[PDB]
Amino acid sequence: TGQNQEQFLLLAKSAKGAALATLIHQVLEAPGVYVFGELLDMPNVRELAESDFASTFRLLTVFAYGTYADYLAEARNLPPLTEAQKNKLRHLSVVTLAAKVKCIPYAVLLEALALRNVRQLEDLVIEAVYADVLRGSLDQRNQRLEVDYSIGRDIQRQDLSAIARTLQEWCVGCEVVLSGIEEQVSRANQHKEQQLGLKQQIESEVAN
């Protein structure tokens, strides 16, 4: 998303209670809009929380943080969604699965997305690749989805530290590798010179 962010933010700053509540049903039922971080952080939408349109805010929370199974568990409270919105939420659930592991078996996908046959799942993964949400390839024989690239959905202000917790884990990793080379290179010289020196001693005994 990029154009839709500005296009809907312009309407978000110039909308009220009911208009915002219907705008949530309009942003969720629109192709390309998979991130709702800027829209959920709005004071105009914050007013809807714990108000007359609370379930719509909870629906936006599920679409920005939760999965399709979390929606199924709270379907009695949350407003009803069309096939397009159910699909979108399924795409985002596959993204969460892809964020967890690279190789997803069909069984985990069928259970998490609540699907019956393989083609439905395959068609949903196709719809994901087609909407530039996921990158990867499907393996029929081993019944597994190989994920090459998955987008970012969750913002997580409180859990943001975890990102740094992995980034530092990579940094330290580099800091080890780098030092490793520095040491190994030094050893590669430490041996060479030593050997040369030793050879120069052997060669000095030839005169005797």
């Binding site: 992995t166 990579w170 590798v177």
Partner: protein
């Protein structure tokens, strides 16, 4: 002035070509300066030939005892390494290419020929010597450049040589440092027969002020390509070819010990060492990649 070398002085070249100082001394030409563009183009072409020998022409000029290579271009010829003066088959092509190159501002003329020795080192074979002798008889000043694309890749260091032949009957001086190279057994006989019929020039490289700037700025993104090299499978056929030759070298070194040259085993050991060291370096880059991108987790 970094870019001074790029200035073309036509009258000065005509003056040098009319003077012919090389006729006064067969060791006149001692240095070979190659542009970064020509090196890259020749190495790219040499690699594109794979395990087959390819050849091309080099455009440039002369400056005192130095031969300067500014550019190069591939020749659509068959029989490089088997046909004496194989370049001759591309005569028409060469004339048109150069004519068209002059139309766009390539002023430098033919300075030499380059060809590849995939996996068998930089030197001149019997066919190469006949070809270069013809070129020095009819196309003087001319130089022969040999590249090993396979060894370049495997060693991570450019494997190139620049050579000039001696006229028929003329004997070389005491000079001949001869930097050691592993020569495969199917080539060593011919190498030995013709090794004293030519000499090696001192090679150096150059780039422009803009090339310097652009290469630093290229690095700011080109670093990614150094951590995604995959050298072990790119030219895997080289190490296998070398091992296939090494085995016959070891067969000869065994035959030397059998009954009864000067220590073939030590030569074969240095060859096997070099090949193995290159293989381990490949694994070193692979392990480095595994340490950086795989051993991270959630």
């Amino acid at each position: 002035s970094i870019d001074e070398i790029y200035k073309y002085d036509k009258k000065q070249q005509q003056e040098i070509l009319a003077a012919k100082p090389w006729t006064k001394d067969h060791h006149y030409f001692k240095y070979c300066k190659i542009s970064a563009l020509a090196l890259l183009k020749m190495v790219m072409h040499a690699r594109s030939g794979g395990n087959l020998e390819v050849m091309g022409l080099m455009l440039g000029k002369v400056d005192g005892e130095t031969m300067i290579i500014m550019d190069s271009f591939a020749l659509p010829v068959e029989g490089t390494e088997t046909r004496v003066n194989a370049q001759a088959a591309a005569y028409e092509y060469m004339a048109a290419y150069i004519e068209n190159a002059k139309q766009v501002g390539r002023l430098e003329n033919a300075i030499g020929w380059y060809h590849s020795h995939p996996g068998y080192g930089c030197w001149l074979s019997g066919i190469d010597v006949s070809t270069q002798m013809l070129n020095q008889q009819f196309q003087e000043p001319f130089v022969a450049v040999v590249i090993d694309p396979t060894r370049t890749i495997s060693a991570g260091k450019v494997n190139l040589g620049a050579f000039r032949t001696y006229p028929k009957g003329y004997k070389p001086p005491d000079e001949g440092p001869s930097e050691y190279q592993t020569i495969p057994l199917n080539k060593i006989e011919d190498f030995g027969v013709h090794c004293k019929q030519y000499y090696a020039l001192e090679v150096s490289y150059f780039k422009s002020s803009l090339d310097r700037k652009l290469l630093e700025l290229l690095w700011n993104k080109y670093w990614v390509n150094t951590l995604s090299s995959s050298s072990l499978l790119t030219n895997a056929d080289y190490t296998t070819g070398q091992v296939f030759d090494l085995s016959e070298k070891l067969e000869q070194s065994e035959a030397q010990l059998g009954r009864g040259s000067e220590d073939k085993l030590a030569k074969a050991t240095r060859d096997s060492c070099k090949t193995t060291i290159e293989a381990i370096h490949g694994l070193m880059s692979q392990v480095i990649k595994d340490k950086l991108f795989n051993q991270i987790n959630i």
